From a paper:
A new GlcNAc-specific lectin (PVL) was purified from the fruiting bodies and mycelium of a fungus, Psathyrella velutina and then structurally characterized. The lectin therefore adopts a donut shape with six GlcNAc binding sites, and is expected to present strong avidity for cell surfaces presenting high density of terminal GlcNAc residues.
GlcNAc is also present in the branches of these glycoconjugates, either β1-2-linked to mannose (Man) on the trimannose core or β1-3-linked to galactose (Gal) as part of polylactosamine extended branches. Nevertheless, due to the activity of galactosyltransferases and sialyltransferases, these GlcNAc residues are not in terminal positions in normal tissues. Similarly glycosphingolipids contain GlcNAcβ1–3 or β1–6 linked to Gal but not in exposed terminal positions. The occurrence of aberrant βGlcNAc-terminating epitopes has been observed in a limited number of cancers, including human leukemia cells. The aim of the present work was to produce a recombinant form of PVL and to characterize its fine specificity towards the different GlcNAc-terminated epitopes that could be present on pathology-related truncated forms of human glycoconjugates. The avidity of the lectin for GlcNAc-decorated surface was evaluated on arrays.
Author numbering: 2 to 401
């Protein structure tokens, strides 16, 4: 089940044994999930010093652009889109190749502060197309294989800067809301959540308002205080809506056809009223049990809090599953990336954090409870010069 969000543009597999990837000063480095835990440099590019890559101008992702289920390195650079393909053996093509003179800072006028760039398999080809929410609307470049990307085309004249879409007010996602397996657009706009149905052919149907909530102008949902996710809360592979609001967690369940039901307060925690603050805490939805549905995970003050989904979008009690990864243990949103991702292959998401001095993990027992914290390795951390301003780090399934 693939959902692409602004916060998590690189989806991960359930089950999986996700790797760690880092775009450091000197290039691209990986920690292969395996019996030997080490940092390996794979490309002398896509780095602050290796190619002049900047977080304020360029976009760096992992995505399968060839169709072999081994994600490639994709960077939206200064004058075009650059790709280093995955060789399958802990190496990548170096140097990367320039596949399209668009979607770039000085080619097409793309801006981190104004626009969104994703890679997604929008036509079920098995290959990721380039997808951008730009000025005029959503632009796609078809991945025709073999490094051949077609000229960018307007997929739909909406969800663009020109239609009032703003990173400081609104949210945009790609997610299948119909069940046909095609990722549709989900946008939390000014006054409505809208969807736009993927027609399969590089176009989206007109925006349709589905929910008059979860937006700044409909309920007072703000970017700085009230995060929102799109995720399957029921198990039918159709995405639902979840928001962390003031009183707690609100949901709107998919009716099954890309229309959405009533908005309900389903849990009185993980909200502003329980102390949660975007500036100090991390809130995620991931599958932590064999039910294969969105459970709630929060990196709070004292540790990690979890509420398990009963299977139908209603939730059990909140339990502090570990007394670590929290604000009280030194964890800072502007320094220490945290992800909820299967690292062990059992289908139950685990925890990994890039800490001050070590990368730390903590493994799901298989039932949504967790074991003790493990120090994985002393690298890819603040202490080794990895900052949010100069580097990008992800959990990603590089080998499949
Ligand atoms: C960030 C980026 O795109 N780096 C690639 C580099 O891009 C340079 C631009 O940074 C510079 O402004 O202009 C030239 C065109 O004159 C390039 O497009 O190009 C490198 C290859 O020369 C590539 O390795 C970098 O990844
Ligand atoms: C950002 C956004 O939601 N854009 C949509 C646009 O939204 C406008 C608001 O920007 C404006 O503040 O108020 C009006 C209603 O009074 C709309 O909600 O509306 C468009 C028309 O539906 C839509 O296509 C844009 O995406
Ligand atoms: C962002 C959010 O939680 N919106 C929901 C709305 O929340 C308001 C608060 O914005 C305000 O601070 O406090 C009051 C209670 O006195 C509410 O909790 O509540 C709406 C339901 O009443 C809900 O639809 C909004 O999404
Ligand atoms: C943000 C957060 O962690 N909220 C949980 C709440 O945490 C509070 C702390 O915010 C505060 O600093 O101290 C008290 C204890 O002195 C709690 O740790 O704790 C709640 C109950 O455990 C939990 O429901 C909140 O989600
Ligand atoms: C944020 C983080 O890495 N927390 C772990 C903690 O790391 C600390 C740093 O917060 C501190 O600034 O430096 C010291 C060394 O003096 C540690 O590296 O270490 C804790 C246990 O060793 C761990 O539980 C925190 O998660
Ligand atoms: C930010 C943005 O949408 N840029 C697009 C660009 O990619 C596209 O090729 C061009 C075509 O007219 O128009 C805009 O300039
Ligand atoms: Ca669909
Ligand atoms: Ca569902
Ligand atoms: Ca696991």
């Amino acid at each position: 089940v693939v959902v692409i969000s602004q916060a998590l543009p690189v989806p991960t597999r359930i089950p999986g044994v996700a790797d760690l990837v880092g775009f450091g000063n000197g290039g691209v480095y990986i920690i292969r999930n395996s019996l030997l835990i080490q940092v390996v440099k794979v490309i002398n590019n896509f780095g602050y010093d290796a190619g002049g890559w900047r977080v304020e101008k360029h976009v760096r992702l992992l995505a399968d652009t060839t169709g072999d289920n081994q994600p490639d390195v994709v960077g939206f650079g200064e004058n075009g889109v650059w790709i280093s393909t995955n060789n399958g053996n802990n190496t990548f093509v170096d140097p990367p190749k320039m596949v399209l003179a668009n979607f770039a800072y000085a080619a097409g006028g793309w801006r981190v502060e104004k626009h969104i760039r994703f890679m997604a398999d929008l036509r079920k080809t098995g290959r990721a197309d380039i997808v951008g929410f730009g000025d005029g609307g959503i632009y796609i470049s078809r991945n025709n294989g073999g490094g051949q990307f077609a000229p960018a085309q307007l997929a739909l004249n909406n969800f663009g800067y020109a239609q009032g879409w703003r990173l400081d007010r609104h949210l945009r996602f790609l997610a299948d809301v119909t069940g046909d397996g095609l990722l549709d657009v989900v946008g939390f706009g000014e006054n409505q959540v809208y969807i736009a149905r993927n027609s399969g052919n590089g176009t989206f149907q007109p925006a349709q308002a589905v929910v008059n909530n979860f937006c700044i102008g409909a309920g007072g949902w703000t970017i700085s205080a009230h995060p929102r996710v799109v995720a399957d809360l029921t198990g039918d592979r159709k995405a639902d809506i979840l928001g962390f609001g003031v009183a707690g967690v609100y949901t709107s369940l998919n009716n099954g056809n890309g229309t959405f039901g009533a908005v309900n307060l389903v849990l009185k925690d993980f909200g502003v009223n329980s102390g949660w603050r975007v500036e100090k805490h991390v809130r995620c939805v991931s599958s932590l049990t064999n039910k294969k549905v969105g459970d709630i995970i929060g990196f709070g003050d004292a540790g990690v809090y979890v509420a398990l989904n009963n299977g139908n979008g209603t939730f059990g009690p909140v339990k502090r599953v570990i007394d670590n990864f929290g604000y009280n243990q030194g964890w800072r949103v502007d320094k220490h990336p945290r992800f909820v991702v299967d690292l062990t292959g059992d289908g139950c998401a685990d925890i990994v954090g890039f800490g001050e001095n070590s990368v730390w993990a903590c493994m799901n027992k298989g039932d949504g409870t967790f074991g003790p914290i493990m120090q994985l390795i002393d690298d890819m951390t603040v202490s080794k010069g990895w900052t949010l301003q100069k580097t990008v780090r992800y959990a990603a399934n590089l080998y499949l």
